[PDB]
Amino acid sequence: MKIAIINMGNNVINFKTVPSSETIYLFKVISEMGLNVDIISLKNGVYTKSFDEVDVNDYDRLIVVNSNLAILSAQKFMAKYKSKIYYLFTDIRLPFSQSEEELLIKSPIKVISQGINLDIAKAAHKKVDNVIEFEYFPIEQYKIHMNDFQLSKPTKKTLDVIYGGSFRSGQRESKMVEFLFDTGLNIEFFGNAREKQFKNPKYPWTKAPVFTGKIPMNMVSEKNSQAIAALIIGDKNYNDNFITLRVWETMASDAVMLIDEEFDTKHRIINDARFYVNNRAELIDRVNELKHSDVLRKEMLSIQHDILNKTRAKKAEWQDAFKKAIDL
Ligand SMILES: O=c1ccn([C@@H]2O[C@H](COP(=O)(O)OP(=O)(O)O)[C@@H](O)[C@H]2O)c(=O)[nH]1
């Protein structure tokens, strides 16, 4: 059984970019499952093999992630594969889609949805003509199942709330402004967003949080740990659907995880109302409570790390479910 992983939109080579990084981490966790795996990209290197140095049909399973030569190359390569393509649907904005006959992909496609609501995964892929089947699998838990995963230790607090990410093309501007702007709290927004991007008239604000630059994927939980709390919000279609990597990066940190009620109305992540907030007012009160009650803050951290540990204790079941999802 030989498996190959391709990144459809970006060149994979190092841990410089987030797309290249998450691809090497998937590869790492899949390898640690005891599977013979290769990443195919533009160049041969210490992590990758080039498209021209391999025969697409030597692989029994072809896994595709998404995050231009890399695109053209991947399409051309996939177009020659004679079996089913397993697409990891990790971002609602990145469903599978085709880029004339040398690029036309005719193979059936299995979309492994990170979101539990398969109707949303279907609607996003409605323009796909290929035979396509859907299945849910919590792909994002790959970070916590990695062999060298370590929980973040107690850190000195220099911030109240923190959030790391990008602007997502304004996909969640409403929520960012509601919870991170004009709170009168000491907030930091790290990543690719910039204050200037928040120009939508529908969401007025007076004072913005502090925008700092992006950090490596492997530094996120350590960065989150500088604050009392770290916020979990999502796009509209993530609500009650996707559990994102930020949930685990936050849960593993020394920052108490505060979740937008709308993101998880059933309280699937943690069945404890103290971790959820409905609006800006509740976020403020909740952070003030945490700042002034160490017993509370420490109790909540202990509860979230516990949940994290119980999930990590089901690694074998997670690995099996992954193998089954790729027809093994
Ligand atoms: O400077 C940063 C900020 C974010 N991230 C990664 O980007 C993810 C968030 O991506 P996004 O902004 O697209 O939002 P999401 O849909 O995941 O909540 C984080 O969880 C991190 O893993 C990172 O590596 N460095």
**How far is C-alpha 146 from the chain's CA centre?**
15
Ranges in the chain annotated CATH 3.40.50.2000: 1-143+310-326, 144-309
| Ligand 1 and 220: CB distance under 6 A | yes
Q: Dihedral, CA atoms, 3, 9, 13, 19, nearest 10 degrees?
A: -100
Resolution of this model in Å is: 2.2
| Ligand 1 and 163: CB distance under 6 A | no
Burial 63-91 (b: 16+ CB within 10 A, else e): bbbbbeebbebbbebbbebeebbbbbbbb
Instruction: Find the helix or strand (DSSP H, E) in which 109 lies.
Output: strand 109-113
Joined tokens for residue 143: 């970070």
State the distance between the two ends of the chain, measured CA to CA, in whole angstroms: 9
Instruction: Tell which CATH architecture fits domain 144-309.
Output: 3-Layer(aba) Sandwich (3.40)
CB atoms within 10 A of CB 249: 25
Distance of alpha carbon 177 from alpha carbon 175, whole angstroms: 5
CB atoms within 10 A of CB 123: 11
Distance 42 CA to ligand 1 centre (A): 25
User: Of 22, 166, 247, which is best to mutate to test ligand 1, by the most ligand atoms within 8 angstroms of its C-beta?
Assistant: 166
Residue in the block written with tokens 């892929």: 125
Task: Locate breaks in the chain with C to N over 2.5 A; list the residue preceding each.
Answer: 67, 99
Is residue 153 helix, strand or coil? coil
Distance of alpha carbon 51 from alpha carbon 48, whole angstroms: 9
CA angle 185, 186, 189 (to 5 degrees): 115
Work out which ligand 1 atom sits closest to the CA atom of 191: 1
Work out which ligand 1 atom sits closest to the CA atom of 217: 24
Contact predicate 39/5, CB 8 Å? yes
Contact predicate 114/137, CB 8 Å? yes
Integer CA distances (angstroms), 156 to 37, 126, 149, 150, 160, in order: 41, 49, 22, 18, 11
The CATH number of domain 1-143+310-326 is 2.60.40.10: no
Distance of alpha carbon 90 from alpha carbon 85, whole angstroms: 15
Nearest to 220 by CA among 197, 194, 196, 188: 188
115 beta partners: 242
- Sign, Cα dihedral of 135, 139, 145, 146: positive
Q: What Rg value do the Cα atoms of the chain yield, rounded?
A: 21
| Ligand 1 and 169: CB distance under 6 A | no
| Ligand 1 and 164: CB distance under 6 A | yes
Nearest to 241 by CA among 218, 264, 259, 221: 264
Distance 258 CA to ligand 1 centre (A): 16
Torsion angles phi and psi, residue 112, rounded to 5 = -95, 100
- Amino acid identity of 17? T
| Ligand 1 and 157: CB distance under 6 A | no
Experimental method used, please? X-ray
Crossing angle of helices 294-312 and 280-292, in 10° steps, is 100
- For atom 23 of ligand 1, the residue with the nearest CA is 217
Looking at residue 53, the DSSP 8-state letter turns out to be: G
Length of the chain (residues): 328
Torsion angles phi and psi, residue 163, rounded to 5 = -150, 130
User: Of 15, 18, 218, 242, which is best to mutate to test ligand 1, by the most ligand atoms within 8 angstroms of its C-beta?
Assistant: 18
Query: How many separate helices (H) and strands (E) can be counted in the chain?
Result: 10, 13
Nearest to 111 by CA among 99, 100, 91, 101: 91
Q: Dihedral, CA atoms, 42, 138, 300, 160, nearest 10 degrees?
A: 40
Distance of alpha carbon 21 from alpha carbon 323, whole angstroms: 22
Distance 217 CA to ligand 1 centre (A): 8
- For atom 4 of ligand 1, the residue with the nearest CA is 165
Q: Dihedral, CA atoms, 75, 76, 82, 85, nearest 10 degrees?
A: -20
Joined tokens for residue 76: 């051309």
Is residue 224 helix, strand or coil? helix
Distance of alpha carbon 255 from alpha carbon 245, whole angstroms: 15
- From edge to edge, which strands make up the β-sheet containing 61-65? 48-50, 36-41, 2-7, 61-65, 85-89, 109-113, 132-136
